Amino acid sequence: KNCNYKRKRRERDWDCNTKKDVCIPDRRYQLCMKELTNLHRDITFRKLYLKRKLIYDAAVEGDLLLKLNNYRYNKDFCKDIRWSLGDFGDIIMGTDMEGIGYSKVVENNLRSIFGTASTAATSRTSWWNESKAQIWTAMMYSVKKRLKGNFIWICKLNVAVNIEPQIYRWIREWGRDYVSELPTEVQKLKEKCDGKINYTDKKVCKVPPCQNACKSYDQWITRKKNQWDVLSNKFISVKNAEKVQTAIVTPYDILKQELDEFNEVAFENEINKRDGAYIELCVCS
């Protein structure tokens, strides 16, 4: 059904339990791969066949993402295009980090086509780099259909096709989720735990629904911290898999680039529950 409609963003939080070395976004789980899953001639013909199947899945993915975006054509939509396109790329290149269920089937199908010799990985990257512009076009079809020649400037093609390791992109995506969730969770804390100027005891000291709001906030921030540690640890593993090391980029550098107002110290305080706002609202001491 993931090729029929998308869950609301953040309806399901990042999943770190299924594959323990990485946290997987719901968007990735829902990536449309129907045609890719449902995959004799020369290998050249079969690659051509693959392209067309990838175009179909990409077109559907872009259509459902736009519907999820309620046809707004805003930054959220363009990010989703970039994330999903990127994931398609990693699937094609064989560097996707999910590799469960039908993703495993898809990887088997691609290996039937490209083989598994020592040149396979390179030729798979070559095929993607040669094809990715058309896949973006396929993903943007639903936009082209409604906006015609003006679809070109809704989202940036170049940004979308520029190759980046999957864990880089997922950290960007995760960060955008975090900054969307944070004020929302702080709202709930404030509403239940906010105090008048002349209070004597914090509400959290003895007021049950404030305590339960703090408990619930604790559960959320504990997930966020867990997710950040897992993704950060995966960032290190993926980096160390690179034969040559770039002499340094950290996950915070990525967050700093993706996010508007990022502040590493503030961020680290929040996920460790030692920020001023949390302490004010949830620590009775």
Author numbering: 2 to 40, 49 to 256, 258 to 295
Question: Can I see the authors' text?
Answer:
P. vivax Duffy Binding Protein (DBP) is a surface protein that the parasite uses to invade host red blood cells and is a leading vaccine candidate. DBP is a member of the Duffy binding-like erythrocyte binding protein (DBL-EBP) family, and binds DARC through a conserved cysteine-rich DBL domain known as region II (DBP-II). DBP-II engages DARC through a multimeric assembly mechanism where two DBP-II domains initially bind one DARC to form a heterotrimer that rapidly recruits a second DARC to form a heterotetramer. Consistent with this view, the most polymorphic region, identified as the DEK epitope, is positioned immediately adjacent to the conserved DARC-binding groove.
